[PDB]
Amino acid sequence: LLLQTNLINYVTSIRPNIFVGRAEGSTQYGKWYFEVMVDEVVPFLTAQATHLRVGWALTEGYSPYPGGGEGWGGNGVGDDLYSYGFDGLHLWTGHVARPVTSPGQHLLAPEDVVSCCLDLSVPSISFRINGCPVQGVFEAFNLDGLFFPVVSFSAGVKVRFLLGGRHGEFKFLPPPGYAPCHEAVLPRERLRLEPIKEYRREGPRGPHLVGPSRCLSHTDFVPCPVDLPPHLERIREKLAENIHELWALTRIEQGWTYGPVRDDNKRLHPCLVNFHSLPEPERNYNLQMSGETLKTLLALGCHVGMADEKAEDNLKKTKLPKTYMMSNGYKPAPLDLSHVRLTPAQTTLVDRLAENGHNVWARDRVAQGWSYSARLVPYRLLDEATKRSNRDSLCQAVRTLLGY
């Protein structure tokens, strides 16, 4: 009936920058593994016990909310349906706990190791004490977003957090098939530890009020490739040869003058000749992926029409940089597709076409069992270096605009 009251301590959660999820597309392996080091000896400092938990939580937690909570105070991991965790003697889901069994039967203590598990086909989570399995597994989730390696701590805690190949010295051997979780990072920055859903941070002036941040999703982490006039099919080799001029340009700088044995390491190349002199899979190699590109170019929504016809041959090549000549006689010489400064849409249309090329190749790589293992992510999410080469390579093919 009445309104009872009492004292509650505080807790906070910390997670890395890694983001793992399962969906149609690039979904890694669904097999991840990590450990952790704990050396805290403060069980009853400031009355209540020192909360310490580790586990998973999906990307809709919003749990931290320092202060009030649901059961008693703004608790940490395990007291909801959006986080799964372990303490040493109990499994927590929905703010209710159940005892577990293991050899030793003691909760987290200094100088100990706990090993978590992830397997997104069964999908189920298991845990492992320092050297023995923990008899209990969760299943039947509703995986729709991603997951966080989450830790919980009250106060007076100096836990070291183990990752793997970067610096984490794995004490024990992962079970057969489990990525050390250092590979999965956003390929646009470094990794770091940050508190989740932070809305106040320190600074030289002091407190800083920060609003909601942004996050990815299941659909975002999935590459998606994009879905006759005589002159369209008449150019073909004319654009291909114009593209094929550059095929030796910097391969002159590489010093690869028509290597007859395909020297992959000692600087020679076997496809550095004319189209008919080229091997069998070398004509559609520069035309099938280009003819379809032009065929798809109508779906790109561009405003293009072959109507230049400036003497039909005014596109002159640039050549004669010293000897520069091979046994084939190519002496590569790109044509006059240089004074074409494109259009505001073409600055993005070339990029949009480049995005399709990366996405199309991603689907091809994904088809063979995600490149059959042994390193490319979806477009606009990938690195910066890959965003550089793909523009210039496709630009030369695209510079034929207003030339034919």
Partner: protein
């Protein structure tokens, strides 16, 4: 009808016997998740002597089965502690008891 579940290992060799003082710096809760007693909040180590029955029998027989330095989880049946009437004003009639008990020193 008492159940004992170890939480952290202790000495495992020295056990309290009759005619010996015991100090218990414990806390206590109810079965439904509310706590109605504590000693850490008062910051005074509760001390008692076994054998003269100044404490509820369930508590003493539970403590008789643990060693020095051990923290454990104790569960008393309602029939062993404040059976029917209970302690008026603190505990309801016919309720299960939960205790968080640890022993500081002196066996």
């Amino acid at each position: 009808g008492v159940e004992i579940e170890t939480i952290s290992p202790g000495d495992g060799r020295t056990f309290p016997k009759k005619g010996q003082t015991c100090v218990v710096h414990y806390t206590g809760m109810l079965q439904n998740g509310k706590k109605f007693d504590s000693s850490r909040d008062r910051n005074k180590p509760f001390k008692f002597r076994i054998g003269k029955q100044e404490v509820i029998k369930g508590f003493e027989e539970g403590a008789a089965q643990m060693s020095l330095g051990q923290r454990a989880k104790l569960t008393c049946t309602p029939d062993v502690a404040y059976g029917a009437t209970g302690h008026p004003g603190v505990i309801p009639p016919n309720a299960t008891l939960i205790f968080d008990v640890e022993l500081l020193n002196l066996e």
